[PDB]
Design a protein around this ligand. Structure first.
Ligand code: CL
Ligand code: CL
Ligand code: CL
Ligand code: CL
Ligand code: CL
Ligand code: CL
Ligand code: CL
Ligand code: NA
Length: 129
């Protein structure tokens, strides 16, 4: 599914991401935009053989199981495929564990390079939140 911007904001917000670990909703929307263009189906292969999955491009090196990332962990206890669902529950639940791991949203390299310190509130402007 390709979410609309406000659609994704509303789902993130429902699922409890707004101000999760002190990150306003716009940070999460911005992250999703630059990670997946709001596409739940987005995948990207990393150089190390791991793969990033879903709207927040969660990586199989640590966070999910895809059966093809040697030495990896599955800290969210999910098949990576669950991160591709039109239901964002698994992505949000796993993102909450990621963002609590000590580096906050710096865990998402695209958030650090494209969202951090920007007017991230723009990403939820106009939404009936
Ligand atoms: Cl947009
Ligand atoms: Cl915001
Ligand atoms: Cl594996
Ligand atoms: Cl393969
Ligand atoms: Cl594990
Ligand atoms: Cl599995
Ligand atoms: Cl933080
Ligand atoms: Na894994």
């Amino acid at each position: 599914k390709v979410f609309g911007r406000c659609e994704l904001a509303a789902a993130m917000k429902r699922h409890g991401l707004d101000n999760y670990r002190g990150y306003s909703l716009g940070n999460w929307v911005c992250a999703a935009k630059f990670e997946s263009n709001f596409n739940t189906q987005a995948t990207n292969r990393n150089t190390d053989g791991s793969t990033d999955y879903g709207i927040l491009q969660i990586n199989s090196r640590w966070w999910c199981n895809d059966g093809r990332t040697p030495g990896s962990r599955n800290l969210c206890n999910i098949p990576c495929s669950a991160l591709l669902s039109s239901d964002i529950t698994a992505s949000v639940n796993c993102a909450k564990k990621i963002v609590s791991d000590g580096n906050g949203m710096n865990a998402w390299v695209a958030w650090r390079n494209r969202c951090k310190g920007t007017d991230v509130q723009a990403w939820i402007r106009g939404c009936r939140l």
